């Protein structure tokens with residue numbers, strides 16, 4: 702196809718939850734658009750200063766009144782969300798995904814994705830990477846590796862609070878598998894009930910380039926396979942290597958596309 706000059710603004714809002722292919726989608730969107738896509742890894746690697754800003758935004762998010770129409774308090778909140786996302790062409794992952802309805806208002810010409818997968822595979826992946834149970838010894842290795850990156854309790858607070866916001870819960874028993882599974886199913890159901898189908902594409906792990914590129918009116922990137930990154934096995938290796946070498950920069954060349 703012809704090359705066209707794309708606008709550097711949010712063009713794709715992905716409502717999918719963590720551990721549903723968000724990093725592969727981030728990479729895929731950057732391959733298509735040649736500009737950055739937001740993801741938790743963007744916070745970790747480039748924008749740790751944004752942690753407190755997302756936390757403040759979630760703390761105030763209860764004061765959003767669902768437009769239309771648009772109130773003054775909502776506008777203040779929307780301006781800070783637009784500020785956080787300046788320079789990016791898409792959103793994925795926590796902390797953004799729970800804001801999908803508000804992002805649709807701010808970027809009315811953006812299209813919406815939902816990444817989904819088997820609920821038990823999701824929970825297993827989540828327990829291995831994001832939210833190990835309190836008495837799981839792996840949780841201590843996770844925390845040891847994360848300190849190497851400069852991640853502290855405020856990082857974990859943002860994950861917890863952005864998950865609570867996505868699930869619209871005032872509190873959450875993070876160690877309760879039944880609660881998390883029900884929240885996952887209800888969240889994915891609600892996205893599909895809220896977003897007009899003309900503006901939504903539901904992606905399953907393995908769908909690849911074709912449905913995504915058709916939805917976005919772009920050619921399939923030639924000779925580039927659809928990304929497959931961020932498996933829990935890979936994350937386990939990264940945590941262990943962070944622990945062993947005590948720096949990211951010592952090991953970064955061993956994780957090329959993930960990072």
Ligand SMILES: O=[N+]([O-])c1cc(N[C@H]2CCN(Cc3ccc(OC(F)(F)F)cc3)C2)ccc1CO
Nearest residue numbers: 719741742745794795830831843847860936960
């Ligand atoms: O949904 N979350 O908020 C969310 C939380 C976490 N959690 C923490 C706790 C386990 N810890 C291990 C870890 C993981 C990735 C790393 O990757 C890199 F350094 F960025 F490359 C380094 C260390 C990271 C991970 C991903 C996400 C969402 O994508």
Ligand SMILES: Nc1ncnc2c1ncn2[C@@H]1O[C@H](COP(=O)(O)O)[C@@H](OP(=O)(O)O)[C@H]1O
Nearest residue numbers: 719720721722723724725826928929931932933
């Ligand atoms: N192209 C692909 N095909 C199949 N699975 C994929 C994939 N890209 C990512 N995944 C899976 O998506 C999960 C990561 O999602 P996220 O990037 O949102 O954290 C991982 O699941 P597992 O942990 O079950 O391996 C990873 O293996």
